[PDB]
Amino acid sequence: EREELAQQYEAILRECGHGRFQWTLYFVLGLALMADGVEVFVVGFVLPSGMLGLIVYLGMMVGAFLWGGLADRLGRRQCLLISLSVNSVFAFFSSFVQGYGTFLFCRLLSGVGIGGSIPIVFSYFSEFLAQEKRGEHLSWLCMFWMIGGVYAAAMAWAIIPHYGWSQFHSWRVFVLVCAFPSVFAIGALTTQPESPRFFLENGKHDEAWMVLKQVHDTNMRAKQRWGVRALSLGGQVWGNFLSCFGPEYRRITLMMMGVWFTMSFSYYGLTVWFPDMIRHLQAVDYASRGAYMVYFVSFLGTLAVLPGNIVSALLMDKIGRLRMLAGSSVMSCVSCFFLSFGNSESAMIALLCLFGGVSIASWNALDVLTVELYPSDKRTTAFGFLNALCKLAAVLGISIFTSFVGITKAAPILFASAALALGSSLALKLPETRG
Ligand SMILES: COCc1nn2c(CN3C[C@@H](CCC(F)(F)F)CC3=O)c(C(F)(F)F)nc2s1
């Protein structure tokens, strides 16, 4: 069967152990995730400078599902290469455009390219990690999203600190420097093999043996008519997506959808309500008598997330994944309640940092759970579907929370708190990755 092969694969991985190969691949996929973080920041904060920049999220969901589904039939390295190439190509194109139409079309296609970054990188990394400590290592890899977010925030604060709302223009230079991480990720990933789990599942056992030999050698330095092809490939992708909701994985997938949607909705609503709330406070304080404030707030908020991820990774395996996920979701809800006490910009930044640092642990734990609960034959399909669900949640939360801006700080707080409470409730029902 396929369960007995998993035990053999885990035995080979454990016998080899961690080493150079895993860390090199860790940095490669870290660059790949840095690209995704950069694009998320760019869409969330830079593109509006109005509401029509959400097209990039709406394309990120499509790309996430498409690349996740394809990665099971074609490969994690090949499909990640294709997706990162699309993202880099269109991010590079965006710089030379001369209007918002072409600019947003290029950003939409680059978002389609980068949508499948997270699913494929997480499945691809988890397929090289032994069960002994893969939670801590996936949590370590989660850091690179924060690195990319802070990188983009710093480059925006340094390059274009002024609004477009009243390579030559500063924003074009910012665009291409933000595209750089994708190019570095592609260049790094071209030097990596293909995950042997995918080869073994497809039937290329000899290629899986070659990949495992490469891993061991690297670690040893330590211690129309023809259109039926596309039609059938899409058919396999659809069949895997439908099997994710089969007699088994239906309850698991529904719980995963609920928790992922709650987390993403809350986070993406709040991180767009925070700079807007601070800016409205500044406006009313100047009335009590240009854009680099948003980028500085984003830089601080995404930088504050990194200590939380340091603590999460070191404690992911010592404590667990259900315990971490629950103790992070309820703490995120509590911090959403605390958001009321942020009655001034000074406190608003501190509460934003607190919320991010508290919440990163639930995302780490849920990554590990979603890669440990789905077999390799549907890991990337389900992960890409849930990433598309998260992007839709991000669009919905951004829209709602930006509609709340300047009216009341209790509606965003209660929306996020209810979302996180429902997410924590559904997370408590998630089965332990063990079963
Ligand atoms: C989109 O849903 C599938 C996944 N997305 N995703 C991410 C990307 N992040 C990090 C989150 C930070 C929340 C807060 F508040 F803690 F900072 C926001 C987001 O989108 C990661 C990680 F970056 F952590 F590696 N892991 C996965 S799975």
Swiss-Prot record:
Modified sites of kind Phosphotyrosine: Y286
Q: Which residues form the signal peptide?
A: none
Looking at the keywords, is Iron present?
no
Name the membrane topology term.
Answer: Multi-pass membrane protein
Q: Where does it reside?
A: Presynapse; Cytoplasmic vesicle, Secretory vesicle, Synaptic vesicle membrane
Residues annotated as coiled-coil are none
Instruction: From the Swiss-Prot or TrEMBL record, give the protein name.
Output: Synaptic vesicle glycoprotein 2A
Q: What is the organism of origin for this protein?
A: Homo sapiens (Human)
